[model samples]
Target: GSIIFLEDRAFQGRIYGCTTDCPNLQPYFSRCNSIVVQSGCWMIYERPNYQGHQYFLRRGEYPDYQQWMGLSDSIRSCCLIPPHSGAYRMKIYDRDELRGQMSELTDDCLSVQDRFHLTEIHSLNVLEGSWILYEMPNYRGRQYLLRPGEYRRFLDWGAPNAKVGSLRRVM
Candidate 1:
């Protein structure tokens, strides 16, 4: 996250945040696209209703699982057990009580399918065109940035064993 200033064709100053918006932010489209793209700004379009929305999300880059888990360093250090091959279960517990579990069997370093299914079961639904934060470089390290659209689809199917403390929090 860094911020940048951009000057529109008219050369007006507009401030933007790196993770948010900055003046002179580059648009992925093109120079002419600047007409539609705001100068030095981050735009979040309304959620789309179809496949066209897929373009907004960016996939994260992680050279390996070790790095992928490092994005949230402290949390990763405490919770995840370096992912292993074959069958594994992400068991959810609430207040020290067993609540539910999601099992995954994968040959790949990361099981996208299992993660998708787990997301659904957890009631995590991506609104159409809503962006999901993905790491970049197609596989290396845990650094992440917000993408432009919603691409991950998860299904919610079961109930939790009980109420649990937050698994995620911003500190």
Candidate 2:
């Protein structure tokens, strides 16, 4: 996938194109005020080396920072969401280490709370494909990337809180 970052709005100012992970983007441009995703999906970080707030980006044009719901114009790192060709399956757990109440899901969940009657997801097990978990309903708020594995806790997927509102497969 290809993405271009611009320092100014409306695709102006210093531009940088990337098709792979850029751990440190300060040398190329201090901040990213705008961005354009030419293909596929990507994740941008507020800090370098893939740290801090994460923003998910799909194939589209973000004319300004606000377009991406960015808190600031400073984007320090970026990584492409690699394509996955497999079925989507996962188990959401209410407690840690796959314990407690759980619900199996093979399709996209727009609201875990409504489906499972739960407000928080403390753990999960990704049985197939890759997925993105959103902290708010309708795929909004903080995003946590998950692969085929067991996440003992929310922090295992880089989440600061246990609240998980929505989830979807990476297509």
Candidate 3:
């Protein structure tokens, strides 16, 4: 039961569907299989009206190199890395409000010296609302995104929740 959290960084290029994925992809997208992440599609931290950006979350292993694209390529702010295979809950929020919760999740078991291909990319798409990821009660590797206003604040790391797992991996 572990988790890997990442913060969104501005000014990085983004990849769509592929191209890049990991906990620390900002400085390495220069040499990997990457695609252009669409703008005005997904929100970093689920916030809207902000600059259109793109990013990905990959659990386990690291890519050999990062990829780059032409102008108009955007990057996302944050991503999560899975350290172990277990359950996770992804929560969705709408401007500090409680939207709902999803549970019963698991990450593929990670083996030592395993290829980066042994990871999972949990892509996020934010509507006109905000959201946060959280660790649920009695669940290993479980996480959820909070609805807006649920905590009377925007998305931030280490937010309060009914339960929490551990963050064992990072890049």
Candidate with the greatest TM-score versus the true structure:
2
In terms of lDDT, which candidate is stronger, 1 or 3? 3
In model 2, state the lDDT of residue 70: 80
Ranking by lDDT: 2, 3, 1
| Lowest summed lDDT window (length 10), candidate 3 | 61-70
Q: Tell me the TM-score of each prediction against the true structure.
A: 0.20, 0.94, 0.22
| Model 2 lDDT per residue over 1-171, tens place | 999999999989989999999998888998888899999888888999988888888899999988877889989898887787757899989999999988899999999889998889999999988788998889988887787999998889998889989998887
Candidate 1: where are CA atoms >4 Å away? 5-13, 18-98, 102-119, 123-171
- Candidate 3 lDDT over 1-171, as tens digits, reads 221222222323442232223333345343223222332222122212222322223333222112221122223233322232333333323223443332222232232113122122222223223232324222223333332222323323333433333221212
Positional deviation of residue 138's Cα in model 2 after best superposition, in angstroms: 0.5
Superposed by TM-score, candidate 3 places the C-alpha of residue 75 at a distance from the truth, in angstroms, of 5.0
lDDT of 2 at 117: 88
Error of 3 at 63 (Å): 17
lDDT of 3 at 20: 21
How many steric clashes between backbone atoms does each model show?
Answer: 31, 0, 50
Q: What is the C-alpha lDDT of each candidate?
A: 0.23, 0.88, 0.28
